């Protein structure tokens, strides 16, 4: 029936959440810097085709906080973003997941953002891939909006599909 799926994008400050939203709007990192708006938008929506069917993904950029409200938790799919160049970024995703999403039926996708940069060891007891396995998530999906042309919309197809068939 419904073809608009809500996705909460979660991660530490400057882990690249805003970049993910802008990428859904077809803007790479270069154009994101050229753009100047009166106010930054923490929501973004765009068309996402799944199996030839027109769907829409509504992204909600959740700014970093030690605590999330039920308003920031309810969604069709959660996108946990960490920065491959920030060794402290994944711990936040893992903590938020266990605290708010582990005991729910909301599908979760982990995104390794800024994949264009050089990977560093994450300061967490578990590796990102092991964490996904333990909690029955897909593998961490590499992502970058730092491209010559429009960023790849692969993660958005994935997020939308996961939301469709929870
Ligand atoms: N190299 C690189 N830098 C990025 C990427 N995405 C964001 N950044 C930079 O990382 C910083 C934080 O990004 P932003 O999207 O504002 O993070 P947010 O605070 O989580 O929304 C900015 O200086 C961005 O230009 C990416 O894919 N690659």
Author numbering: 415 to 580
What do the authors report?
Human Miro1 and Miro2 (hMiro1, hMiro2, also called RhoT1 and RhoT2) are MOM protein homologs that play a critical role in mitochondrial trafficking38394041424344. Both associate with Parkin upon mitochondrial depolarization and are ubiquitinated on multiple lysines18374546. Here, we demonstrate that the cGTPase domain is necessary and sufficient for efficient ubiquitination of either hMiro1 or hMiro2 by p-S65 Parkin. We also find that despite considerable similarities between these two substrates, Parkin modifies hMiro1 much more robustly than hMiro2.
To better understand the difference in ubiquitination efficiency between hMiro1 and hMiro2, we first determined the crystal structures of the isolated cGTPase domains of both proteins to high resolution (hMiro1-C: 2.25 Å; hMiro2-C: 1.69 Å). The overall folds of the hMiro1 and hMiro2 cGTPase domains are quite similar (rmsd 0.78 Å over 129 Cα atoms). Unexpectedly, both domains crystallized as symmetric dimers. The dimer interface is a highly conserved hydrophobic surface along one face of the cGTPase domain, which, in the intact hMiro1-BC structure, forms the interface with the second hidden EF hand (hEF2). The cGTPase does not mediate dimerization in the context of the full-length molecule, as the hEF2/cGTPase interface is mutually exclusive with cGTPase dimerization, and hMiro1-BC is purely monomeric even at high concentrations. Interestingly, although the same conserved residues mediate dimerization in hMiro1-C and hMiro2-C, their dimer relationships differ significantly. We performed size exclusion chromatography with in-line multi-angle light scattering (SEC-MALS) and confirmed that both hMiro1-C and hMiro2-C dimerize in solution. We note that the two lysines in addition to K572 identified as ubiquitinated by mass spectrometry of the hMiro1-CD, K454 and K512, can be mapped in the dimer, but not the monomer, to roughly the same continuous surface containing K572.
